[PDB]
Short mmCIF file of all heavy atoms in Angstrom, two decimals:
data_model
loop_
_atom_site.label_atom_id
_atom_site.label_comp_id
_atom_site.label_asym_id
_atom_site.label_seq_id
_atom_site.Cartn_x
_atom_site.Cartn_y
_atom_site.Cartn_z
N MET H 6 -53.75 21.28 -3.85
CA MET H 6 -53.09 20.81 -2.65
C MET H 6 -52.47 19.45 -2.90
O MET H 6 -53.05 18.62 -3.60
CB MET H 6 -54.09 20.68 -1.51
CG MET H 6 -54.48 21.95 -0.84
SD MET H 6 -56.10 21.81 -0.09
CE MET H 6 -57.13 21.55 -1.53
N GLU H 8 -50.44 16.46 -0.37
CA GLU H 8 -49.78 15.94 0.82
C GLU H 8 -48.78 14.85 0.46
O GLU H 8 -49.07 13.98 -0.36
CB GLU H 8 -50.76 15.33 1.83
CG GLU H 8 -51.81 16.22 2.37
CD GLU H 8 -51.47 16.75 3.74
OE1 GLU H 8 -50.26 16.81 4.08
OE2 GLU H 8 -52.40 17.10 4.49
N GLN H 34 -46.18 23.65 3.88
CA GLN H 34 -46.40 23.58 5.31
C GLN H 34 -45.95 22.23 5.84
O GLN H 34 -46.35 21.19 5.31
CB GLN H 34 -47.88 23.80 5.65
CG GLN H 34 -48.38 25.18 5.27
CD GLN H 34 -49.21 25.82 6.35
OE1 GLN H 34 -50.32 26.29 6.11
NE2 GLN H 34 -48.67 25.85 7.56
N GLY H 37 -46.61 18.39 10.74
CA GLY H 37 -46.36 17.56 11.89
C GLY H 37 -46.61 16.10 11.57
O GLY H 37 -47.46 15.76 10.74
N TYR H 40 -46.16 14.67 7.65
CA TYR H 40 -46.94 15.21 6.54
C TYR H 40 -46.38 16.56 6.11
O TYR H 40 -46.14 17.44 6.95
CB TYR H 40 -48.40 15.35 6.93
CG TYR H 40 -49.15 14.05 7.08
CD1 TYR H 40 -50.08 13.87 8.09
CD2 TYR H 40 -48.92 13.00 6.21
CE1 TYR H 40 -50.76 12.69 8.23
CE2 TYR H 40 -49.61 11.81 6.33
CZ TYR H 40 -50.52 11.66 7.35
OH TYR H 40 -51.21 10.48 7.49
N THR H 42 -47.36 19.52 3.15
CA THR H 42 -48.36 19.90 2.16
C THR H 42 -47.82 21.04 1.31
O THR H 42 -47.08 21.90 1.79
CB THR H 42 -49.69 20.29 2.83
OG1 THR H 42 -50.76 20.06 1.91
CG2 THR H 42 -49.69 21.74 3.24
N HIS H 74 -55.76 17.27 -4.05
CA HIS H 74 -57.10 17.83 -4.03
C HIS H 74 -57.12 19.17 -4.75
O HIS H 74 -56.19 19.96 -4.62
CB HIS H 74 -57.59 17.99 -2.59
CG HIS H 74 -59.08 18.13 -2.46
ND1 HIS H 74 -59.92 17.04 -2.39
CD2 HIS H 74 -59.87 19.22 -2.37
CE1 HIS H 74 -61.17 17.46 -2.28
NE2 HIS H 74 -61.16 18.78 -2.27
N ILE H 76 -59.71 22.53 -5.29
CA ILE H 76 -60.91 23.30 -4.99
C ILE H 76 -60.99 24.41 -6.02
O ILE H 76 -60.11 25.28 -6.08
CB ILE H 76 -60.89 23.87 -3.57
CG1 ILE H 76 -60.55 22.77 -2.55
CG2 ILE H 76 -62.23 24.49 -3.23
CD1 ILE H 76 -60.60 23.24 -1.13
N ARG H 78 -63.08 26.88 -6.36
CA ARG H 78 -63.32 28.19 -5.77
C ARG H 78 -63.47 28.01 -4.27
O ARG H 78 -64.32 27.24 -3.82
CB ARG H 78 -64.57 28.85 -6.36
CG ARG H 78 -64.85 30.23 -5.80
CD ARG H 78 -66.06 30.86 -6.47
NE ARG H 78 -67.28 30.12 -6.18
CZ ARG H 78 -68.01 30.27 -5.08
NH1 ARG H 78 -67.63 31.15 -4.16
NH2 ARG H 78 -69.11 29.56 -4.90
N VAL H 79 -62.63 28.68 -3.49
CA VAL H 79 -62.68 28.51 -2.05
C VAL H 79 -63.46 29.66 -1.43
O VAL H 79 -63.53 30.77 -1.97
CB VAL H 79 -61.26 28.42 -1.45
CG1 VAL H 79 -60.43 27.39 -2.19
CG2 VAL H 79 -60.57 29.75 -1.48
N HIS H 80 -64.07 29.38 -0.28
CA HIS H 80 -64.81 30.41 0.44
C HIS H 80 -63.85 31.46 0.99
O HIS H 80 -62.67 31.19 1.24
CB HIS H 80 -65.61 29.78 1.58
CG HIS H 80 -66.76 30.63 2.04
ND1 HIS H 80 -66.60 31.71 2.88
CD2 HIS H 80 -68.08 30.55 1.78
CE1 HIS H 80 -67.77 32.26 3.11
NE2 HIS H 80 -68.69 31.58 2.45
N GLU H 82 -63.78 32.67 3.92
CA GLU H 82 -63.29 32.29 5.24
C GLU H 82 -62.05 31.41 5.15
O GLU H 82 -61.22 31.42 6.07
CB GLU H 82 -64.38 31.55 6.02
CG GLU H 82 -65.69 32.28 6.18
CD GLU H 82 -65.72 33.16 7.41
OE1 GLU H 82 -64.74 33.13 8.18
OE2 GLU H 82 -66.73 33.86 7.61
N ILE H 86 -56.82 30.89 6.26
CA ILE H 86 -55.89 29.83 6.65
C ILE H 86 -55.04 29.35 5.49
O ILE H 86 -54.36 28.32 5.62
CB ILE H 86 -56.64 28.66 7.31
CG1 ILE H 86 -57.54 27.93 6.32
CG2 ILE H 86 -57.47 29.14 8.47
CD1 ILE H 86 -58.13 26.65 6.88
N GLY A 11 -53.80 15.22 8.69
CA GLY A 11 -53.21 15.97 7.60
C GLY A 11 -54.01 17.22 7.26
O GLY A 11 -55.20 17.34 7.54
N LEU A 12 -53.32 18.16 6.61
CA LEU A 12 -53.89 19.48 6.39
C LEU A 12 -54.89 19.52 5.25
O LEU A 12 -55.83 20.31 5.30
CB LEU A 12 -52.76 20.49 6.15
CG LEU A 12 -53.12 21.93 5.79
CD1 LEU A 12 -54.10 22.52 6.79
CD2 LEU A 12 -51.88 22.77 5.76
N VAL A 13 -54.70 18.72 4.20
CA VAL A 13 -55.55 18.82 3.01
C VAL A 13 -57.00 18.44 3.30
O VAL A 13 -57.91 19.19 2.89
CB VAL A 13 -54.96 17.99 1.85
CG1 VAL A 13 -56.00 17.77 0.77
CG2 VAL A 13 -53.78 18.71 1.27
N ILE A 16 -58.47 21.37 5.08
CA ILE A 16 -58.80 22.48 4.20
C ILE A 16 -60.12 22.21 3.48
O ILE A 16 -60.97 23.10 3.38
CB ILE A 16 -57.66 22.73 3.20
CG1 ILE A 16 -56.51 23.50 3.85
CG2 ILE A 16 -58.16 23.54 2.02
CD1 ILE A 16 -56.83 24.92 4.17
N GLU A 17 -60.29 20.99 2.99
CA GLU A 17 -61.55 20.63 2.33
C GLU A 17 -62.71 20.74 3.32
O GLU A 17 -63.77 21.27 2.98
CB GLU A 17 -61.45 19.21 1.77
CG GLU A 17 -62.69 18.60 1.12
CD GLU A 17 -63.44 19.54 0.19
OE1 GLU A 17 -64.25 20.38 0.64
OE2 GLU A 17 -63.22 19.45 -1.04
N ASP A 20 -63.53 24.43 3.91
CA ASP A 20 -64.22 24.96 2.75
C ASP A 20 -65.68 24.52 2.73
O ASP A 20 -66.58 25.34 2.54
CB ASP A 20 -63.51 24.53 1.48
CG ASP A 20 -63.98 25.30 0.27
OD1 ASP A 20 -63.83 26.54 0.26
OD2 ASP A 20 -64.49 24.67 -0.68
N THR A 23 -67.72 26.26 5.61
CA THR A 23 -68.09 27.65 5.37
C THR A 23 -69.02 27.79 4.18
O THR A 23 -69.80 28.76 4.12
CB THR A 23 -66.83 28.49 5.17
OG1 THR A 23 -66.02 27.90 4.15
CG2 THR A 23 -66.04 28.55 6.46
N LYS A 24 -68.98 26.87 3.22
CA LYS A 24 -69.90 26.94 2.10
C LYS A 24 -71.30 26.46 2.48
O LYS A 24 -72.28 26.90 1.87
CB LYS A 24 -69.37 26.11 0.92
CG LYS A 24 -68.46 26.87 -0.01
CD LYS A 24 -68.26 26.11 -1.31
CE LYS A 24 -67.00 26.56 -2.01
NZ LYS A 24 -66.36 25.44 -2.74
N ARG A 29 -68.21 31.24 10.71
CA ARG A 29 -66.91 31.87 10.50
C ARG A 29 -65.81 30.91 10.93
O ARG A 29 -65.84 30.38 12.04
CB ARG A 29 -66.79 33.18 11.27
CG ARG A 29 -67.47 33.18 12.61
CD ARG A 29 -67.09 34.40 13.42
NE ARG A 29 -67.15 34.13 14.85
CZ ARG A 29 -66.39 34.72 15.76
NH1 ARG A 29 -65.50 35.64 15.42
NH2 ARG A 29 -66.51 34.38 17.03
N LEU A 30 -64.85 30.68 10.04
CA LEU A 30 -63.65 29.92 10.37
C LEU A 30 -62.88 30.69 11.43
O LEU A 30 -62.39 31.79 11.18
CB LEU A 30 -62.78 29.71 9.13
CG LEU A 30 -61.73 28.60 9.11
CD1 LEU A 30 -62.14 27.42 9.96
CD2 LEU A 30 -61.42 28.18 7.69
N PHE A 35 -52.46 22.97 14.13
CA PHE A 35 -51.65 21.78 14.00
C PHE A 35 -51.41 21.19 15.39
O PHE A 35 -50.86 21.86 16.27
CB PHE A 35 -50.32 22.06 13.30
CG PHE A 35 -50.46 22.78 11.99
CD1 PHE A 35 -50.12 24.11 11.87
CD2 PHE A 35 -50.93 22.10 10.88
CE1 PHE A 35 -50.25 24.75 10.65
CE2 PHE A 35 -51.06 22.74 9.67
CZ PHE A 35 -50.72 24.07 9.56
N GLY A 39 -49.65 14.80 12.89
CA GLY A 39 -50.47 14.81 11.71
C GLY A 39 -51.88 15.32 11.93
O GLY A 39 -52.57 15.61 10.95
N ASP A 68 -56.04 11.12 4.41
CA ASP A 68 -56.15 10.11 5.45
C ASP A 68 -57.44 10.24 6.26
O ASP A 68 -57.65 9.47 7.19
CB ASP A 68 -54.94 10.18 6.37
CG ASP A 68 -53.77 9.36 5.87
OD1 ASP A 68 -53.88 8.78 4.77
OD2 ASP A 68 -52.75 9.29 6.57
#
Side-chain angles (χ1 to χ4, degrees):
Chain H
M6 282 154 296
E8 300 260 24
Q34 297 225 231
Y40 289 141
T42 206
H74 199 86
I76 309 184
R78 181 177 65 83
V79 310
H80 202 281
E82 304 271 356
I86 67 172
Chain A
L12 176 52
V13 164
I16 281 290
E17 176 44 278
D20 193 60
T23 53
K24 272 194 201 146
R29 36 169 209 151
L30 199 31
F35 308 107
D68 273 3

